[PDB]
């Protein structure tokens, strides 16, 4: 079964893998993000509500007054999208917020309210997203790309010893908050722990430890293990367990209860550990020499003397042992300090602590944060507190806290936005464990540590910054308390927030100018992920690791589609099925596998979870019951790819297409292409130019329909029905009975854009693709946009190509193209240019626009009206005049055609400031626009009044008035008629008054439209009025253009060749492109040969259908053929039966297939060569796909048969007339007197420094001396050069470059004296 739109031309496709999940809405990453930013969230966790709850309520310093938030809404936009685009105003919505002002008595208990005041407050204009996920700022369309940055949390990284000579590995731990100051813990080559904040001077770590009110004893308790000693008779015995014997050497014979357990002198052994644990002995004596290396854990003082016998973190000797024995200190606490297991890391840092009382510690912190300042204790305490524990100045966000807890093996994932002592302690402990071999470092490039930030988050961040500024302002204002004099609106000033949001949307790193010259470009532009921008890497700062592709990129970002050159691997594009998680992590679909059966259940898996399961392959051969046909299948588990049994699998890929982006997925036969050539093929396919008339690609992928429909370039039926009136500019759709609303059903109208400039000077055009009086359903395609054909993406044309060297005209990469291509206008494009003339008010008289021009012949005024603006349709050329603007001196400042560009004027737009008289030309355009708008509105009026009067006649027939008498009477007389039945009379007068209601609201919308059109346009200050002119040019292909295929075989047209010279086969049909075979093997993009072969069969089926149509053979035998073509193939998923099709549908489909049957091919489930041969056999074509050809010039048969087929060719956006220019003598720069640069400025080229070296390498000195002095800047001498040339004498004058004198003065502008010398 099919809807009626695709029944017009069913595109046959190969492919053996059934679809489980169809392609989602391609734009869901963008649009669904912004919906989180303006919808009302009762929970207060998303967008504006969450932003408001984080600043409000605000209380005065005295606390007698506060301001509270109530609710908000977004007002209706003043204009729609089209009016904003034409007028150059930002499509935006006003912001309404209900604020509450509460006053407290200072003489009453707290909470006693003096008065309350409720009032909505204007807060500014918020830009609003259009229907296609774009933004409109100043008549243009800008789209916000999605950033990709380091996930807030904590990471452990190792530098691999590169920075040190010995290569010893150093470990560091970093905590990256969502907003606030960082924190770094590092190990030095001396193996001591240090802490630093915000990349400042490195500081000993223990400084922070005591800053949290920790004594030395507490630190040693937290970071080490205790060893206890008891004073027995002349002995210091200790309790020993086997577990604490790892990696130790028995200095003496380990024995207890009089039995020797361990040998003496050598290292410990596991067998001795086993026998000791079997004995289960705890206490053991130790000699004195073994205690010579241990460190006391705690402090010891004498009760009698009261003096410190020995403090903690201090080595002990036999004399200290004597004091502790004579003082009664029986129990001695020491540190375990096993270097191979528990290194003395913290103790050594303790040994280098400058102070211990935490006062000088806070002083040191405060000095380090800001050098050269008085160290006030309270100031230092406040600095530390608001540095790492203030709720406003530091915030870790929900996702950061979740990552922090997950990394530290905690369980609860909900917490505060500020840190805690325990969290820092835990991070330190895990860093020590990492140093001890336990655990493993994290990976930066892993997609589990990087998140996707959309437009919503960025808008929220800008809004919060603005809100902080305005709340500081209102707090300052409220500090000067007043006895309820003000209303809760004066203190709130919307200018800061409005300016902040506007500047972020307008001028920023990521707000980019959308390049919409074909639907694929703008789709793949909306779906871009960038690692640049605020809070990310720069173009140079990135190393060789971020650029490279990581094994967790499977299914989430396209590995083969990315810009090439200065930033590669930083602008990777999102995949097809991938969608962002709730936290902001990329995740992909998968199918659950239970008991070797693959169900249709779909689970979305993020990066981290992908590391725990076993994932099968997309094209894993499968039975009819979900059982894997082998017991051995290919799978991937953790970045590896290995065989597995049928029972260890858990998930399988949804479809074979889920690895590449859209741009790569549009490339047929991708599975036979090198990665480099596929990359360049996609990147060039993104840059096609719309053709004058579009043609379907014969060999596509099959998702062109999805790409075209998803992008907003083709009008789509909102409600199904039957088409009523069709026009080259408007379409009228009457809705069906079921789909109409209960009231005011009416009809639906679509207005089509015709020849409006794009953002790269190409033409946006729409042509209806439906006829009069045929049904349409919901979601069909009614009007094809640019480069679209029946709702199918169509970038370029399809040309009859042959691979053979031809007298060198296609020597290296060039293409030789026959004249029959340019005769049929298959590549001539339309380019539209824009010119603007401004009228300001300067001195010496303002800028006036009129037809009065001095010192000009009547030729320059023939193409001008009496109002001073060119007529619509004049064939203007270079150097002519468009808008006559003069300034009294009269100064001829009128706008002129830029040199070298011709065209035909198609539209003129005039903008006038409010309160300014409009000239007659603006009056004409205004009245014409009003007339067209009233024509439209009166058309809807006629339809609606006809409907309501049909209702009225239905009422009146039942009322008693005869139908014939009704019909004879005039239209408006039906209301005044009398009806005997009261309710029928009541219904008649009621309809006459909703007649009145309808006409009156039509009248008020009339007056509103008339006022808006007459309403003065908002302009820049100091500007009176501006005028704009549009120019239309048709470009044809000429030697030097850039044409390219889809697989990366670009090139340049060499020579347009007369048709009689091209090679031709036995049938006499020439080939109109002659490519070059030598570029296939080395480039190794063998996909193009297979595509050529497949296309050659596509026209083979097309020609036969053409033969039957010419002979007008019966539908029965025709219907027989078409069905046989579709059934061809092995286990093809698509099955089409033409029995259900009626004869008319079959005939229309056949005549629509006349130019060749489209053949589709999924990206990685392509058609093999066997069915290609089979399809070729269906026609009368040779199976090998190599026919003979005859030379056009000689008529001699080519010795070896060559390849002929149909290849899809795009014309790139690189035209010669946009790049070829030359200069003899033009303008000159004002400062250095060197000629200008750039084609638009008519300047010469740059004799580069490398060119100077190369010209120095020759003996050529005179030419270099020319380049330096005469042709560049010797203003005194270069004039003499011109005069000499005209006289015939070829000689120069050296002179001295003027640019050197400037520098002289400039050096003299400092205190340096530099001067020349004598001759």
């Amino acid at each position: 079964v099919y809807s009626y739109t695709e029944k017009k031309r069913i595109r046959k496709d190969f492919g053996k893998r059934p679809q489980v999940l169809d392609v989602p809405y391609l734009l869901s990453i963008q649009l669904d993000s912004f919906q989180k930013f303006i919808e009302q969230d009762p929970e207060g966790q998303y967008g504006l509500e969450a932003a408001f709850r984080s600043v409000f309520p605000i209380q005065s310093y005295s606390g007698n007054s506060e301001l509270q938030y109530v609710s908000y809404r977004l007002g209706e936009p003043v204009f729609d999208v089209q009016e904003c685009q034409i007028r150059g105003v930002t499509y935006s919505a006003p912001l309404r917020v209900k604020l509450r002002l509460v006053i407290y008595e200072r003489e009453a208990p707290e909470g006693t309210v003096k008065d309350i005041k409720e009032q909505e407050v204007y807060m500014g204009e918020i830009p609003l997203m259009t229907d296609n996920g774009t933004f409109v700022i100043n008549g243009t369309e800008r789209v916000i790309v999605s950033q990709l940055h380091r996930s807030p949390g904590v990471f452990f990284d190792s530098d691999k010893g590169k920075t040190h000579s010995s290569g010893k590995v150093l470990y560091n731990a970093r905590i990256i908050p969502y907003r606030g100051s960082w924190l770094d813990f590092e190990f030095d080559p001396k193996d001591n722990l240090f802490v630093r904040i915000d990349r400042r001077r490195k500081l000993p770590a223990t400084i922070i430890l005591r800053a949290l009110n920790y004594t030395t004893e507490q630190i040693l308790d937290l970071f080490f293990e205790k060893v206890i000693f008891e004073i027995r008779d002349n002995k210091l015995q200790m309790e020993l367990v086997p577990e604490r014997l790892r990696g130790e050497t028995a200095s003496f014979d380990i024995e207890a209860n009089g039995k020797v357990y361990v040998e003496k002198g050598r290292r410990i052994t596991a067998r001795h550990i086993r026998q000791l644990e079997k004995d289960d002995v705890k206490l053991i004596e130790v000699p004195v020499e073994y205690i010579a290396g241990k460190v006391v854990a705690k402090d010891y003082i004498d009760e009698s003397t009261g003096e410190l016998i020995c403090a903690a973190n201090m080595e002990l000797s036999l004399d200290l042992l004597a004091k502790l024995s004579q003082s009664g200190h029986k129990r001695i606490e020491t540190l375990f300090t096993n270097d191979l297991d528990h290194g003395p890391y913290i103790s050594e840092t303790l040994r280098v602590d400058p102070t211990n009382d935490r006062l000088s510690a806070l002083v040191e912190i405060y000095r380090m944060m800001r050098p050269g300042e008085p160290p006030t204790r309270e100031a230092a305490e406040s600095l530390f507190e608001n540095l790492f524990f203030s709720e406003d100045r530091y915030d870790l966000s929900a996702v950061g806290r979740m990552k922090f807890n997950r990394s530290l093996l905690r369980e609860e994932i909900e917490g505060s936005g500020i840190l805690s002592k325990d969290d820092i302690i835990d991070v330190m402990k895990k860093l020590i464990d990492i140093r001890n071999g336990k655990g493993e470092v994290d990976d930066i490039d892993h997609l589990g540590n990087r998140r996707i930030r959309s437009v919503g988050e960025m808008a929220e961040n800008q809004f919060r910054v603005g809100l902080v500024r305005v709340e500081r302002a209102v707090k300052e204002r409220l500090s000067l308390g007043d006895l309820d004099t003000l209303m809760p609106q004066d203190m709130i000033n919307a200018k800061p927030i409005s300016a902040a949001v506007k500047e972020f949307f307008g001028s920023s790193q990521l707000s980019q100018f959308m390049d919409q010259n074909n639907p694929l470009s703008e789709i793949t532009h909306k779906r871009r992920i960038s690692a640049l921008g605020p809070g990310g890497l720069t173009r140079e700062r990135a190393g060789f690791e971020v650029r490279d592709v990581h094994p967790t990129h499977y299914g989430r970002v396209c590995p083969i589609e990315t810009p090439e050159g200065p930033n590669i691997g930083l602008i990777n594009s999102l995949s097809v099925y991938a969608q962002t998680n709730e936290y902001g992590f990329l995740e992909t679909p998968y199918r659950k596998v239970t008991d070797g059966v693959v169900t249709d259940e779909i689970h979305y898996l993020s990066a981290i979870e992908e590391g725990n399961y076993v994932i099968a392959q997309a094209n894993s051969n499968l039975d009819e019951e979900g059982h894997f046909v082998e017991d051995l299948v290919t799978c991937r588990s953790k970045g590896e790819s290995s065989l597995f049994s049928r029972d260890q699998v858990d998930y399988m890929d949804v479809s074979t297409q889920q690895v590449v982006s859209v741009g790569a997925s549009l490339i047929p036969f991708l599975e036979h292409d090198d990665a480099n050539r596929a990359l360049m093929g996609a990147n060039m396919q993104r840059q096609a130019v719309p053709t004058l008339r579009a043609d379907k690609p014969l060999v596509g992928t099959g998702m062109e329909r999805a790409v075209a429909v998803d992008s907003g370039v083709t009008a789509v039926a909102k409600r199904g029905g039957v088409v009523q009136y069709v026009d080259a500019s408007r379409i009228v759709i009457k809705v069906n009975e079921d789909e109409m609303y209960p009231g005011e059903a009416g009809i639906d109208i679509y207005n089509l854009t015709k020849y409006t400039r794009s953002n790269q000077n190409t033409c946006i055009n729409q042509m209806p693709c439906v006829s009069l009086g045929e049904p349409v359903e919901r979601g069909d395609v009614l009007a094809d946009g640019p480069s679209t054909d029946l709702g199918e993406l169509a970038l370029g044309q399809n040309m009859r190509v042959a691979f053979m060297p031809w007298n060198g005209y296609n020597f290296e990469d060039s293409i030789l193209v026959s004249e029959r291509v340019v005769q049929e206008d298959r590549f001539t494009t339309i380019h539209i240019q824009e010119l603007a003339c401004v009228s300001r008010d300067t001195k010496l008289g303002p800028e006036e626009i009129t037809a009065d021009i001095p010192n000009v012949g009547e030729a320059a005024l023939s193409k001008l009206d009496e109002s001073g603006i060119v007529y619509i349709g004049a064939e203007v050329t270079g150097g002519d005049i468009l808008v006559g603007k003069v300034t009294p001196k009269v100064k001829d400042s009128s706008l002129r055609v830029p040199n070298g560009v011709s065209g035909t004027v198609i539209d003129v737009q005039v903008f006038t400031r409010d309160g300014v008289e409009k000239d007659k030309r603006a009056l004409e355009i205004e009245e014409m626009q009003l007339k067209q708008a009233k024509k439209d509105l009166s058309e809807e009026l006629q339809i609606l009044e006809a409907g309501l009067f049909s209702r009225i006649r239905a009422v009146l027939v039942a009322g008693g008035v005869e139908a014939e008498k009704l019909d004879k009477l005039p239209r408006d007389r039906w209301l005044e008629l009398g009806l005997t039945d009261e309710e029928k009379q009541n219904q008649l007068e009621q309809l006459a008054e909703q007649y009145d209601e309808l006409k009156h609201e039509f009248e008020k919308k009339l007056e509103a439209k008339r006022r808006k059109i007459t309403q003065g346009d908002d302009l820049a200050p100091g500007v009176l009025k501006i005028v704009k002119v549009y120019l239309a040019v048709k470009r044809r292909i000429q030697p030097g253009d850039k044409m390219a295929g889809r697989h990366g075989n670009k090139g340049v047209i060499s020579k347009i060749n007369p048709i009689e010279d091209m090679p031709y086969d036995e049938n006499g049909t020439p080939v109109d492109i002659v490519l070059n075979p030598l570029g296939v093997p080395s480039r190794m993009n063998i996909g193009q040969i297979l595509e050529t072969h497949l296309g050659m069969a596509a026209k083979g089926i097309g020609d036969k259908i053409n033969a039957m149509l010419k002979q007008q053979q019966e539908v029965a035998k025709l219907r027989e053929f078409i069905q046989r073509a579709y059934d061809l193939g092995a286990d093809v998923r698509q099955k089409v039966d033409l029995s259900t099709f009626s004869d008319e549908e079959v005939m229309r489909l056949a005549e629509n297939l006349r130019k060749g049957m489209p053949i589709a091919t999924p990206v990685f489930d392509g058609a093999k060569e066997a069915e290609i041969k089979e399809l070729l056999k269906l026609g009368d074509l040779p199976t090998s796909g190599q026919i003979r050809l005859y030379d056009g010039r000689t008529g001699e048969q080519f010795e070896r048969p060559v390849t002929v087929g149909y290849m899809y060719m795009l014309k790139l956006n690189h035209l010669v007339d946009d790049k070829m220019h030359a200069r003899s003598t033009g303008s000159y720069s004002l400062v250095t007197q060197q000629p200008l640069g750039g084609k638009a400025q008519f300047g010469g080229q740059r004799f580069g420094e490398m060119e100077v070296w190369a010209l120095e390498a020759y003996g050529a000195a005179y030419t270099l001396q020319e380049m330096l002095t005469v042709k560049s800047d010797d203003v005194n001498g270069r004039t003499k050069m011109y005069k000499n040339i005209v006289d015939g004498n070829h000689q120069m004058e050296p002179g001295m470059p003027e640019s050197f004198n400037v520098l002289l003065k400039e050096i003299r502008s400092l205190g340096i004296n530099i001067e020349l010398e004598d001759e």
């Binding site: 030097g1040 296939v1080 796909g1185 070829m1220 003899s1224 033009g1226 050529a1260 520098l1303 400039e1306």
Partner: protein, 652 residues
């Protein structure tokens, strides 16, 4: 400078000067009333800050920023750096009489000329046209001449053609890596809007026809014109300065044409007959009466310069093919016939061309190169060599071989299950097994592809070198190598992780057939690395060149002889295996520091202060001298220069 509207454009210099002068005025006014010292200290200090910012912004600390929030330019900022005065407006500066365009191949041009669009030529030579119009009297005032130029009158094109007969122009392509990046040409007027270029020199520019753009400059004076003609003309640049190797080597399409010309078939139409000469042989091929390549006997005549610079004729019969006889016409007199009797791949043909330059000077060798290019293009076009899907012959054994390899690993993994092998042992074992399987498959594929059977004259199968299109385009060296042919038919081979580890499971599929999803994925690890390295190597490498130029830009040869005996000994470099560089090339083209002494004691093989060349080097080879001490530039004694003999022989 004023823009549209009442606003004015102001530079950073004006703002800083205004600030400093205003502060000076304020302090000088405040000092007159003798304010308390606390006031004057701050004013003087912050005036110091203002002057500091004036002379150099951002050196001391926080920099002065404007409305753009970015630091303002200062005097020190306007001298240093790429945007400063020196590197942007003194060492390189924009010029007049220049233009830009897109490159396009032209086969019909000769070696010493290039195309030019009409509009570019007219715009460039407009100053020259004005003078010539005055001389012929077509217009008297310069205004009149300018008027008739823009109308494109019929006389304008005639006078332009007359004035551009021998006016050389310069062609360069940024970046100009080596000195061959700028070459002179003699323009010829063509239609269209693209610049036409000769194919042979495209290798020197490293320029391909995929949208690369050229710039043209025009010399003015007689000194400049003669300088260009005698130094930078194309015909004077055939040996690269880096090394003696030629720079006009034919490539790609021409090579395939020559290869297809000279290759016999075991049987063909018109095989086994006798032909009078090459002139007659061309008559047979065009008439279709004999195949382009079939072994015959032809009378040929070759000349030798073996006498005292004189050519002597000789005549006999040689057993060759029709195509070789056709090719023999364009070879000049001196060369022997054996040089044009082999398969004539890429490596051979250049060699042959080089021999001409060794014997026939310059004019014959350039004419011969041009004739080679013409004939190659013509007979490659008439050949019709095309690539199809069936040309990729997939070896039959390949499939089963993979099975065997599988069985091998099926055992090795078991050894890990039993614990008898470690991770490293298994890894190395599977790596070796897969590498051996790859080598076997590649060898089998090449052996199957490179030969084919065709019936001879007596009706028996005979093996000849195959005429498959891919093999022809690979063996001739026209384009590609055995690695790519491996990539098409046999397995792709082992692929690497980003860090450097080798994946244990190789890609068993080839490009002719399909690649399942994960194989294509793991194949992109290497390609992204290659693209990233290629993109980021051009930034580092080019910069390095700069540092080399500024160090060595003071070196010019100034004196003939320095008169020192000091030098460095030269020996063939050896690591213990084969010689990496023999003694021949290292010492070639230098001067002997001391006389070369024979292994026989007290015999003078080579006199002191004698340049070495082919006539002296072969003498060393026959005599088998071990090592020689040669004079070198590092030891020359002349100050502020380099001895002429010390530098040795100019390689150009």
């Amino acid at each position: 400078v004023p823009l549209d509207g009442g606003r004015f454009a102001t530079s950073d210099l004006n703002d800083l000067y205004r600030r400093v002068i205003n502060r000076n005025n304020r302090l000088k006014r405040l000092l007159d009333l003798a304010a308390p010292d606390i006031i004057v200290r701050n004013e003087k200090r912050m005036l110091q800050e203002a002057v500091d910012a004036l002379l150099d912004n951002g050196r001391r600390g926080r920099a002065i920023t404007g409305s753009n929030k970015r630091p303002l330019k200062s005097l020190a900022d306007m001298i240093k750096g790429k945007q400063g005065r020196f590197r942007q407006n003194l060492l390189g500066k924009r010029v007049d009489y220049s233009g830009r365009s897109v490159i396009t191949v032209g086969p019909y041009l000769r070696l010493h000329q290039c195309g030019l669009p009409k509009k570019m030529a007219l715009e460039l030579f407009k100053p020259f046209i004005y003078g010539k119009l005055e001389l012929r009297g077509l217009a008297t005032t310069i205004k009149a001449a300018k008027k008739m130029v823009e109308r494109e009158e019929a006389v304008v094109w005639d006078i332009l053609d007359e004035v551009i007969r021998e006016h050389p122009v310069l062609l360069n392509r940024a970046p100009t890596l080596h000195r061959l990046g700028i070459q002179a040409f003699e323009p010829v007027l063509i239609e269209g809007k693209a610049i036409q270029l000769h194919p042979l020199v495209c290798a020197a520019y490293n320029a391909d026809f995929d949208g690369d753009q050229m710039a043209v400059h025009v010399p003015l004076t007689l000194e400049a014109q003669l300088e260009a003609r005698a130094l930078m003309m194309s015909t004077n640049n055939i040996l690269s300065p880096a090394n003696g190797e030629p720079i006009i080597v034919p490539s790609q399409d021409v090579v395939l044409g020559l290869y297809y010309m000279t290759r016999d078939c075991v049987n063909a139409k018109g095989e086994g007959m006798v032909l009078t000469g090459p002139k007659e042989a061309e008559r047979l091929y065009r008439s279709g009466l004999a195949s382009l390549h079939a072994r015959v006997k032809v009378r040929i005549t070759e000349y030798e310069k073996d006498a005292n610079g004189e050519l002597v004729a000789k005549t006999s019969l040689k057993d060759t093919t029709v195509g070789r006889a056709i090719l023999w016409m364009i070879v000049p007199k001196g060369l022997p016939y054996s040089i044009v009797n082999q398969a004539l791949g890429k490596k051979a043909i250049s060699k042959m061309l080089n021999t001409c330059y060794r014997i026939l000077g310059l004019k014959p060798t350039v004419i011969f190169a041009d004739q080679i290019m013409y004939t190659g293009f013509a007979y490659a076009a008439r050949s019709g060599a095309s690539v199809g899907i069936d040309d990729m012959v997939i070896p039959e054994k390949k499939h089963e071989i993979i099975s065997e390899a599988e069985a091998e690993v099926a055992e090795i993994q078991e050894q890990f299950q039993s614990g008898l092998v470690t991770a490293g042992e298994r890894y190395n074992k599977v790596i070796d097994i897969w590498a051996a399987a790859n080598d076997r498959v590649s060898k089998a594929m090449m052996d199957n592809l490179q030969t084919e059977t065709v019936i001879n004259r007596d009706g028996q199968e005979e093996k000849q070198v195959s005429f498959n299109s891919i093999y022809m385009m690979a063996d001739s060296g026209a384009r590609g190598s055995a690695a790519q042919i491996r990539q098409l038919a046999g397995m792709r081979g082992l692929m690497a992780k980003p860090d450097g580890s080798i994946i244990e499971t190789p890609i068993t599929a080839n490009f002719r057939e399909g690649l399942n999803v994960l194989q294509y994925f793991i194949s992109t690890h290497g390609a992204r690395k290659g693209l990233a390295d290629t993109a980021l190597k051009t930034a580092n490498s080019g910069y390095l060149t700069r540092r080399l130029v500024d160090v060595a830009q003071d070196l010019v040869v100034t004196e003939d002889d320095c008169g020192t005996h000091e030098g460095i000994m030269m020996t063939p470099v050896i690591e213990g295996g084969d010689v990496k560089e023999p003694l021949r090339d290292r010492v070639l083209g230098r001067v002997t520091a001391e006389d070369v002494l024979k292994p026989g004691t007290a015999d003078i093989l080579v006199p002191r202060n004698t340049l070495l060349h082919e006539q002296w080097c072969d003498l060393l080879e026959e005599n088998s001298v071990d090592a020689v001490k040669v004079r070198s530039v590092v030891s020359c004694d002349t100050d502020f220069g380099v001895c002429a003999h010390c530098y040795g022989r100019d390689l150009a």
